[PDB]
Amino acid sequence: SFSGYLKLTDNVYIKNADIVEEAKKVKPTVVVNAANVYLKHGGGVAGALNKATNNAMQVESDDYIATNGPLKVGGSCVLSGHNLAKHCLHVVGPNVNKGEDIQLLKSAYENFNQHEVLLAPLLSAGIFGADPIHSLRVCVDTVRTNVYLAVFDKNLYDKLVSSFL
């Protein structure tokens, strides 16, 4: 199971780790992907998770979009976790770099409440442009299920822990 996590609250845990490496080690029931509405897994967490599946996540995602159309910003879909997890919960946080409403970050985190335990990144953080400190705050105040957050960047991880209220 999950190891080396710092407990932030009753249900939120955090670790400085590569979420792909964490997923391959733990093989969690759910790994969260930092998805976009098109499920185009190009960069950041999505690109890394997809590359770890040898592009199987993208092929499956393209079939999902062909059938269902794009997701909503703040929405999610459950697809296969491939070699990383039982399932992948593709969650679309607002992309501040595309001018999307940061208020949708709480709706995006609400998707985590449908799963008892998840391995996840900070939504809308990184290349999505939102403040990761704010993302962690929204996570703690929204997610009630057990969430194990993997923060890739060491300097950000240190700042997140040291500033956590």
Ligand SMILES: Cc1cccc(C(=O)NCC(=O)O)c1
């Ligand atoms: C280097 C940098 C700048 C701004 C934001 C971030 C960030 O939220 N990263 C997420 C993560 O490392 O898991 C990193």
